[PDB]
């Protein structure tokens with residue numbers, strides 16, 4: 085003797101409906117005979133009705149600042165039911181776009197953190213972290229930590245195991261990231277951890293030793309930072325690499341015209357900190373390399389050793405500098421994540 089029932093995921097009259105989720109309508113004691121959704125201009129949204137006729141759902145992205153009208157009719161054996169629902173979606177003050185590293189499909193070293201950089205300051209860090217789904221295989225515990233107002237990083241306690249798949253789903257579209265700011269879009273990346281490559285620069289020997297899966301494969305005489313501009317000790321993540329680059333001290337805050345400044349074109353340069361530490365070709369210091377520290381902070385090595393390093397070291401490999409007269413690389417450098425104690429990194433700084 086029964087009347088079909090409709091259940092929609094939105095209510096007639098709702099405002100600030102968030103656009104992170106599809107809109108659905110379900111029939112009970114009947115099936116769906118017509119479902120249309122239309123924006124404020126009359127333009128159809130459309131979606132998919134399940135084969136059994138019980139569940140309809142939008143299949144495309146719904147937009148910010150829209151007024152949508154949903155019409156639905158369920159026919160039962162015991163009669164009909166029609167509903168019309170009109171609702172408004174979120175109206176952002178601003179949009180932020182995330183950027184993920186490392187690159188999709190890349191193979192990286194064991195020190196590569198997952199990085200989500202937003203193009204605006206994030207007022208609700210908690211909401212951002214909750215929108216980011218990380219899958220690891222083999223599964224391994226990790227945690228988020230913020231390097232600044234825009235960039236959050238995720239990593240395990242220890243260096244990744246080689247062969248780990250890492251999947252990163254940044255599901256920020258439709259999510260309120262605080263003070264009126266909503267994600268511009270979703271982004272996705274997937275990467276894999278490659279060989280373990282750790283290079284150690286010991287100031288006691290002035291040798292940079294590259295170890296691949298625990299074996300020494302290269303031993304590089306090096307000249308590090310002179311006593312007045314020493315190389316900071318600690319763990320550096322390998323970033324980008326250049327056949328040649330102009331090193332401009334202005335990039336890192338220091339005027340070229342200034343006393344500690346510089347502008348020099350160099351070869352075979354591998355970046356290991358945002359503060360501007362590189363491993364690079366230094367033909368002028370070949371005689372100092374292995375003996376005395378002469379640089380601004382860079383790991384000077386021979387031209388063939390620098391090119392070797394460019395060819396054999398990858399994004400996410402590790403350089404550890406030890407025994408220098410300098411301090412420790414900042415944990416928030418950009419490439420100094422591993423210098424923050426796990427207890428502190430785990431507890432995070434979302435609040």
Ligand SMILES: *C(=O)[C@@H](C1=N[C@H](C(=O)O)[C@H](SCC(=O)OCCC)[C@@H]1C)[C@@H](C)O
Pocket residue numbers: 309312313314315316331336344346359360361362379380381382383
């Ligand atoms: C390589 O020599 C680079 C260079 N490395 C350092 C560094 O270790 O930061 C310098 S000096 C920055 C500083 O504040 O030193 C203390 C002196 C008061 C610079 C970034 C260049 C060629 O990229």
